[PDB]
């Protein structure tokens, strides 16, 4: 029993965004709950990233592109690229920083940071798309070693990741989260 743990160990609106997104994409959230937990933690970390940080001479500095439906997310991306002139990233980013006027992709991983980082960098082809990567073990690393955040904010994010890691281990499913199959897509039209 893990889904109840995810429900009770997350912000209600974060889990709401996760479940609505998944339902949009057509996946049964009662079976593949590992993707449920992963999406929830990713959304949570993105919110923390865009939490308490404001651009002013108060306005949110970071707009959370993830967590909203596909058309709305792409509308946000297109509007930002049309006003600021930033190149439209073909892959949906996760956030946009107005001060540096550049999109950011946030990824939380349990494997070593650099392998995930290089994987993403190669996939994106480095088309002017800064990316930041967190890990459950409690280390971070980003493109050009730029985190665009105060040390205390990143410390809070990493501590939250470590705490959820320890709670989930207390539940004993840490090894279960270490498994994720390609796809069990066999829904015949009946």
């Amino acid at each position: 029993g893990m889904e109840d743990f995810v429900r009770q160990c997350f912000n209600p609106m974060i889990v709401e965004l996760a479940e609505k997104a998944m339902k949009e994409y057509g996946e049964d959230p009662k079976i593949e709950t590992n993707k449920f937990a992963s999406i929830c933690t990713h959304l949570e970390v993105c919110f923390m990233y865009s939490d308490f940080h404001f651009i002013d001479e108060l306005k949110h500095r970071f707009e959370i592109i993830e967590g909203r439906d596909r058309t709305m997310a792409w509308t946000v991306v297109n509007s930002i690229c049309n006003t600021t002139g930033v190149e439209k990233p073909k892959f949906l980013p996760d956030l946009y920083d107005y001060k540096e006027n550049r999109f950011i992709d946030i990824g939380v991983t349990r494997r070593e940071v650099h392998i995930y980082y290089l994987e993403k960098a190669n996939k994106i082809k480095s088309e002017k798309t800064h990316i930041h990567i967190f890990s459950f073990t409690g280390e971070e690393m980003a493109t050009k070693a730029d985190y665009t955040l105060d040390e205390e904010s990143r410390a809070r994010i990493k501590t939250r990741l470590f705490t959820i890691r320890q709670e989930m281990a207390s539940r004993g499913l840490w090894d279960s989260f270490r498994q994720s199959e390609r796809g069990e897509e066999t829904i015949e039209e009946r």
């Binding site: 650099h114 980082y117 290089l118 960098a121 190669n122 082809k125 480095s126 493109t143 050009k144």
Partner: protein, 217 residues
């Protein structure tokens, strides 16, 4: 405590041998029988393991042995009553220690392989980076074996028609292996440029052409 290690520059703290300076030779188990070969001294003397201290002269080498500044190295620059100040070799960090405390890469970033092999990273691996060099060969190099090179975004060169070309310019290739291709100049040198073409799938569209094989598109 009292510990002595070979190779250290020591001094004599008492006796008729006072102020004599020398380099330790050997060491023993309990009675160290430390023997320092004094500077400009053909003979070898004998001292107890408490009579010698690690003294150093102005302009010599020193390396911390223990304490808060362990691992730092440099050169003492002043001799106060007992404190000795020096500046770290690797960085400008200030260092104050006793004399006895001393002894005697992102996807598509230009990298230096060797003076004449300023390559461009085209693939990130766990331990290595593929690097397309200026000759058109792809080499694999360890992450720490290359240095990040400062890109000259304002570089200017001549193309095949002696037109001025600049970083970010779109050029056509009219000679050499890539003749007929078109690309964006990413890194520019007088004789060659690293170009990008999204239609080119090899090396993620990163190729290299001589500047005399280019014409501004």
């Amino acid at each position: 405590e009292h510990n002595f290690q070979p190779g250290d520059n020591v001094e004599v703290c008492e006796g008729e041998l006072i102020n004599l300076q020398g380099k330790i030779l050997s060491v023993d188990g309990n009675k160290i029988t430390i023997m320092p070969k004094h500077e400009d001294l053909k003979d070898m003397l004998e001292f107890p393991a408490q009579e010698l201290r690690k003294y150093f002269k102005m302009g010599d080498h020193v390396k911390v042995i223990a304490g808060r500044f362990e691992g730092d190295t440099g050169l003492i620059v002043r001799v106060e009553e007992n404190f000795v100040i020096l500046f770290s070799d690797l960085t400008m960090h200030e260092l104050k220690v006793l004399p006895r405390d001393l002894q005697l890469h992102e996807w598509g970033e230009l990298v230096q392989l060797d003076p004449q092999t300023v390559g461009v990273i085209v693939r990130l691996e766990r331990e290595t980076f593929q690097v397309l060099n200026m000759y058109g060969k792809v080499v694999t190099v360890r992450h720490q074996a290359v240095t990040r090179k400062k890109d000259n975004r304002f570089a200017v060169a001549l193309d095949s028609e002696q037109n001025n070309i600049h970083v970010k310019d779109i050029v056509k290739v009219i000679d050499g292996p890539h003749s007929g291709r078109e690309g964006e100049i990413r890194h520019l040198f007088r004789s060659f440029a690293f170009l990008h073409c999204k239609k080119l799938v090899e090396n993620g569209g990163m190729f290299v052409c001589k500047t005399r094989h280019l014409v501004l598109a």
